[PDB]
């Protein structure tokens, strides 16, 4: 402990990484960094997190889909700037650093973790039209403080 | 299992509408701009079989990589597509998506499953390959 698991967050060092749209009041009071275009928010924690962030260029991995109660292996795109249709939390807009795969994603699946052999790749962010999008974390080097 | 850039079934040739030739247009059977599809008549009989199934996995040919790739793909739907040389930004109908290489020259590559031809490469960008679904056009084998 502490591991993110299915909790909807990544815990690395003194940081907690969540979907920005799911961030709690405490997250915001504890804010480190947040970017709406990436749907990401990072808060500071007292306890030390055990998740390892992948530094690689893997395009294949496995994510947890809560709505199906299953892990799925997926091929996914490199992170890019992609138009995303409106959700409950965002208008139709361009989202940055987003990776897409074919898979099931309901709003409740957000926060599901995508992993490869090297560590945590990203978290479920978007869904619909039979695609699941993941916000990439691999470029944020400062998470490894 | 041919890849010529077109599907040949019976007396029909199925091609991307944006790649259709003058001869295709002089031979026109049906075309739909929102689907990026055009069908023309042919003199010679084609050997392709159109899949009637529900399959969401298959194999497509990517000309730019000179490779066939196994892919899982979405059910056909109405999808926003960024502007290309041939179309303005718009919603394209009956489009199925997978993760894969798709360049403009890859249009016409055929997606197949064990049952037959599923669709043809239509779109690409941000690391996705889109395929225009042909499985609903029943009249192709009628
Ligand atoms: Zn990796
Ligand atoms: Zn099939």
């Amino acid at each position: 402990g502490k591991f993110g698991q299915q909790s909807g967050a990544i815990y690395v060092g003194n940081y907690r990484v969540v979907n920005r749209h799911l961030a709690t009041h405490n997250d915001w009071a504890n804010l480190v960094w947040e970017d709406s275009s990436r749907d990401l928010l990072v808060s500071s924690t007292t306890a030390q997190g055990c998740d390892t962030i992948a530094r690689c260029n893997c395009q294949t991995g496995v994510y947890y889909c809560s709505s199906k109660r299953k892990h799925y292996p997926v091929s996914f795109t490199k992170p890019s700037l992609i138009f995303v249709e409106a959700s409950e939390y965002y208008p139709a807009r361009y989202q940055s650093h987003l990776m897409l795969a074919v898979g099931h994603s309901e709003p409740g699946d957000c926060g599901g973790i995508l992993r490869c052999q090297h560590g945590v790749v990203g978290i479920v962010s978007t869904g619909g039209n039979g695609l699941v999008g993941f916000a990439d974390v691999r470029d944020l080097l400062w998470l490894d403080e």
Side-chain angles (χ1 to χ4, degrees), chain A residues 45-63:
Chain A
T45 67
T46 59
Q48 207 255 337
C50 300
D51 294 316
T52 297
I53 309 302
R55 302 308 176 184
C56 63
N57 306 119
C58 285
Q59 289 187 251
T60 64
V62 174
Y63 80 109

Side-chain angles (χ1 to χ4, degrees), chain A residues 5 10 32 42 48-51 57 62 67 76-77 83-84 87 90 94 97 100 105 113 117 119 132 134:
Chain A
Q5 304 176 77
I10 299 164
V32 175
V42 179
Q48 207 255 337
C50 300
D51 294 316
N57 306 119
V62 174
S67 59
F76 53 94
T77 65
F83 178 76
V84 176
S87 69
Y90 293 109
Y94 283 85
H97 299 266
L100 297 172
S105 183
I113 296 168
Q117 51 188 319
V132 50
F134 304 98

Side-chain angles (χ1 to χ4, degrees), chain A residues 3 8 27 31 41 50-51 73 79 100 110 125 134 140-144:
Chain A
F3 289 89
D27 285 323
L31 181 66
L41 178 145
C50 300
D51 294 316
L100 297 172
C110 284
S125 182
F134 304 98
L140 302 166
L141 304 176
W142 53 267
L143 284 178
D144 288 336

Side-chain angles (χ1 to χ4, degrees), chain A residues 15-129:
Chain A
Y15 297 129
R16 168 173 140 96
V17 186
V18 293
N19 296 90
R20 187 189 183 273
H21 74 272
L22 304 178
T24 68
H25 287 111
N26 183 254
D27 285 323
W28 281 101
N30 295 109
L31 181 66
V32 175
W33 168 86
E34 53 83 23
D35 185 311
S36 292
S37 76
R38 299 177 68 150
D39 187 34
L40 282 180
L41 178 145
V42 179
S43 54
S44 66
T45 67
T46 59
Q48 207 255 337
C50 300
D51 294 316
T52 297
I53 309 302
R55 302 308 176 184
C56 63
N57 306 119
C58 285
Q59 289 187 251
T60 64
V62 174
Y63 80 109
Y64 181 64
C65 175
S66 180
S67 59
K68 297 285 175 181
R69 300 181 183 88
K70 288 200 203 314
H71 291 87
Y72 290 102
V74 284
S75 171
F76 53 94
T77 65
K78 297 182 175 75
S80 63
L81 185 67
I82 298 171
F83 178 76
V84 176
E85 300 282 4
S87 69
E88 179 189 332
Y89 306 88
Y90 293 109
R93 78 202 204 289
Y94 283 85
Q95 181 162 345
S96 66
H97 299 266
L98 182 62
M99 304 172 295
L100 297 172
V102 176
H104 194 72
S105 183
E106 300 179 15
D109 297 326
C110 284
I113 296 168
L114 173 69
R115 313 166 185 278
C116 61
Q117 51 188 319
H118 304 103
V120 174
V121 179
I123 48 172
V124 175
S125 182
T126 75
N129 291 314

